[PDB]
């Protein structure tokens, strides 16, 4: 087995409170309405984000003239705790991205996204992934979401990011955060299936060969 996910991060800073941007809640809701019928697709959306983060790290390291480190995507199910967890060893998120990225689209304009979603030229899941709101799909299956991230940028601190998706999110400095990003999803009552290894394996194996970095599920290689 090869696992990197462990509950070892520790809160080491006081909590700063932030309220959702105006049109953030509306986008959360529309992503949920759009993907309910195939709600298992949140896993693919998050794997895609992880893959993107690893590509961003690659380009940083190429310009830095440095070797590629362990570049991996990990899934972990906990049936007892009713969670699914995804962790990647990519570029991570800065403090300002953790504070601002949730409301990025709406502020920058959601019209292009909403128009594309309406046209249905591609799968709704692809449109959502492409316009950079795949993280929104975490909330549609979650009672609450727990993020740990630390950017590869020099001087970046590690952070814990918490939200129930209701209108507020909380950020605190954390120790023991590995460069990259871990998302812990505490699953909704109708979404418990995704805390089952068998179920998640059945979902992921349908596209795991399309993932360009080593993909692990509960310590087992999927590709």
* Contacting residues toward ligand FEU, per CB under 6 A: 49-50, 53, 88, 90-93, 98, 101-102, 135, 147, 161, 181, 183
Q: Residue 42, annotated ligand binder? A: no
Q: Residue 119, annotated ligand binder? A: no
Cβ proximity to ligand FEU, 79 vs 168, nearer residue: 168
Q: Could you tell me the smallest distance in angstroms from the CB atom of residue 141 to ligand FEU?
A: 15
Of the candidates 191, 189, 197, the residue with the CA atom closest to the CA atom of residue 218: 197
Q: Residue 135, annotated ligand binder? A: yes
Distance, CA of 5 to CA of 145 (rounded, Å): 16
Contact partners, residue 78, CB within 8 Å, separation at least 6: 84, 85, 195
Q: Could you tell me the smallest distance in angstroms from the CB atom of residue 20 to ligand FEU?
A: 9
Tokens found for residue 119: 């046209």
Q: Could you tell me the smallest distance in angstroms from the CB atom of residue 140 to ligand FEU?
A: 14
* Breaks in the chain after (C-N > 2.5 angstroms): none
Cβ proximity to ligand FEU, 108 vs 120, nearer residue: 108
Of the candidates 168, 181, 179, the residue with the CA atom closest to the CA atom of residue 16: 168
Would you list which residues are annotated within the binding site for ATP?
49, 88, 101, 135
Would you list which residues are annotated within the binding site?
49, 88, 101, 135
């Amino acid at each position: 087995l090869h696992s990197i996910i462990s509950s070892t991060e520790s809160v080491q800073g006081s909590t700063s409170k932030h309220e959702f941007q105006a049109e953030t809640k509306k986008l959360l809701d529309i992503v949920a309405r759009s993907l309910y019928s195939e709600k298992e697709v949140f896993i693919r959306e998050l794997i895609s984000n992880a893959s993107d983060a690893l590509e961003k790290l690659r380009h940083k390291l190429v310009s830095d003239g440095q070797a590629l480190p362990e570049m991996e995507i990990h899934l972990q199910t906990n049936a007892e705790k009713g969670t699914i967890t995804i962790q990647d060893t990519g570029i991570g998120m800065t403090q300002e991205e953790l504070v601002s990225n949730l409301g990025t689209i709406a502020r920058s304009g959601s019209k292009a996204f909403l128009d594309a979603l309406q046209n249905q030229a591609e799968a709704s899941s692809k449109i959502i992934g492409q316009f950079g709101v795949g993280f929104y799909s975490a909330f549609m299956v979650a009672d609450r979401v727990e993020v740990y991230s630390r950017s590869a940028a020099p001087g970046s601190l590690g952070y814990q990011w918490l939200s129930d998706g209701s209108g507020v999110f909380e950020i605190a400095e954390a120790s023991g955060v590995r460069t990259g990003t871990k998302i812990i999803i505490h699953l909704k009552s109708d979404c418990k299936e995704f805390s089952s290894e068998a179920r998640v394996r059945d979902v992921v194996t349908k596209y795991s060969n399309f993932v360009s970095f080593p993909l692990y599920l509960n310590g087992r290689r999927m590709n």
